[PDB]
Design a protein around this ligand. Structure first.
Ligand code: FAD
Ligand code: DGG
Ligand code: HEM
Ligand code: NA
Length: 403
């Protein structure tokens, strides 16, 4: 457990670790994979643009420093990570390995700046976070195992049907190879597909949202073909499209993810969507509009009228359900689009213009859409005094630029 002095060192040096985030992880991967090549089967071997990783890593460091004094908020941010780990199959025995190589990388990259007190402070941080995560992950693993149709680790599934949806999206209907029941899931949750990639000679793992509603015997995932041209094609999405066919088998993780409506609660729900179309959003919409009345507000952030399927399905739902408010934003409306009728406000979703409508007592906020969009709204809500534990966001579905 961290003493106040230790916490002060972490807070004072976070800006420096953030600064070298990308160089640190780059060196970390290099060291760890030479010592433990087996771990390449769990980590994503696809290279990402330096600029984006740096941003993401810097944000992670600042998030820790910002919530280190608030255990309630820290646990909130950690539960999203615990779920991702459970899906990937992260084990307790792997924490010491990651810790060693990560600390060696920090010391190497920081050079002079890496004093003895700084390394020890972050070594304690790592140890504390590892302790907490392992426990949370242990609980998740345990809960799944004891669920009807649940399991731990990988379970083999067979592709029953493969249905092309468009020129880039294809759906896969999966059934367990053992023909037994499959554990339920909540819309918003995902599974992880573990598959060998010939080009790499390694196994790779990727998450995919679970489509529709649970039926006790099959799952459906919708996969968008990634990459091409300027961008090197994605490994798993193209592999699934071109080389995984009806009859083949893949390994799946049991459902995980903290992003999903709590159908037990009776508090208000605020949904902020920045591009996600009817997939699997109608499933989550259904849950939100379930019995009995719950105060629901939907904020649809679209570009304009070109694609307006989600916009209409919503006005359809808003027409019927009484406790439902809908707002539409167009970041680049058309000449034929006129405020007050085709939409409510221009530009990207700006919660500041509908504060009266979203500042509901005891509300939970669910945000989906592009990653940059989700971060933006998350931060906007924090500025309005909303607690971390009340903000929920996650990559949801095959196309975050649907409408
Ligand atoms: C919780 C969750 C749910 C998800 N749900 C869905 C879903 O329902 N449907 C879906 O389609 N996807 C979903 N995803 C995304 C999915 O997990 C994969 O990320 C996606 O399929 C792409 O994987 P890949 O193996 O094809 O690409 P990777 O090989 O991982 O490549 C990733 C990207 O990097 C680009 N790239 C590759 N090499 C380089 C390089 N050297 N320099 C620069 N750029 C490069 C690739 O073109 C691609 O765009 C979800 C993700 C999460 C976290
Ligand atoms: C780089 C120095 C690491 C310092 C080690 C001490 C731990 C500090 C970080 C702890 C962060 C805990 C809360 C962060 C909240 C959150 O998860 O932020 C969201 C964003 C992303 O969220 P979005 O907004 O995109 O959604 O996170 C990132 O994208 C991080 C990507 C990490 C990928 C590399 C994984 C490496 C894995 C082995 C372990 C490395 C050790 C821990 C690294 C932690 C950075
Ligand atoms: C105290 C230690 C740890 C912390 C704080 C940590 C934190 C994180 C964070 C913030 C993410 C991204 C979360 C997200 O995208 O939602 C992540 C991803 C990941 N973590 Fe953990 N993690 C820790 C330990 C581990 C360990 C021990 C392993 C196991 C080998 C591991 C494997 C992964 C993998 C594979 C990913 C996915 C990204 C990728 O493929 O590179 N993590 N971790
Ligand atoms: Na070690």
């Amino acid at each position: 457990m961290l003493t106040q002095k230790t916490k002060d060192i972490v807070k004072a040096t976070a800006p420096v670790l953030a600064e070298h985030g990308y160089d640190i992880i780059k060196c970390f991967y290099q060291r760890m994979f030479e010592a433990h090549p087996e771990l390449k089967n769990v980590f994503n071997m696809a290279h990402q643009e330096q600029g984006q990783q740096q941003q993401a890593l810097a944000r992670a460091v600042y998030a820790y420093a910002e919530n280190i004094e608030d255990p309630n908020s820290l646990m909130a941010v950690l539960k999203n990570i615990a779920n991702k780990h459970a899906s990937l199959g992260v084990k307790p025995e792997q924490y010491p390995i990651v810790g060693e190589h990560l600390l060696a990388a920090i010391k190497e990259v920081l050079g002079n700046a890496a004093t003895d007190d700084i390394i020890s402070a972050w070594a304690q941080a790592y140890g504390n976070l590892a302790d907490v995560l392992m426990g949370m992950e242990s609980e998740l693993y345990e809960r799944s195992a004891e669920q009807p149709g649940g399991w731990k680790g990988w379970r083999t599934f067979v592709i029953r049907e493969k249905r092309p949806e468009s020129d880039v999206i294809t759906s896969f209907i999966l059934e367990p190879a053992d023909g037994g029941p499959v554990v339920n899931f909540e819309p918003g949750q995902y599974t992880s597909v573990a598959i060998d990639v010939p080009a790499l000679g390694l196994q790779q793992i990727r998450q995919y949202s679970l489509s529709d509603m649970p039926n006790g015997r099959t799952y459906r995932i919708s996969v968008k073909r990634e990459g091409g041209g300027p961008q090197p094609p994605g490994y798993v999405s193209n592999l699934l499209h071109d080389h995984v066919n009806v009859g083949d088998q893949v390994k799946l993780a049991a459902p995980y993810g903290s992003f999903h409506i709590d159908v037990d609660a009776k508090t208000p729900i605020v949904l902020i969507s920045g591009g996600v179309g009817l997939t699997p959003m109608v499933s989550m919409l259904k849950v939100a509009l379930q019995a009995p009345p719950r105060q629901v507000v939907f904020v649809h952030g679209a570009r304009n009228s070109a694609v307006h399927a989600m916009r209409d399905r919503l006005r359809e739902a808003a027409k019927t359900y009484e406790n439902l408010d809908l707002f539409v934003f167009y970041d680049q409306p058309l000449p034929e689009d006129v405020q007050g009728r085709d939409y409510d406000y221009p530009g990207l979703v700006d919660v500041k213009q509908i504060e009266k409508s979203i500042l509901l007592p005891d509300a939970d906020y669910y945000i989906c859409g592009p990653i940059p969009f989700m971060r933006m709204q998350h931060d906007a809500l924090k500025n309005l005094g909303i607690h971390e534990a009340r903000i929920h966001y996650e990559v949801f579905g095959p196309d975050l630029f649907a409408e």
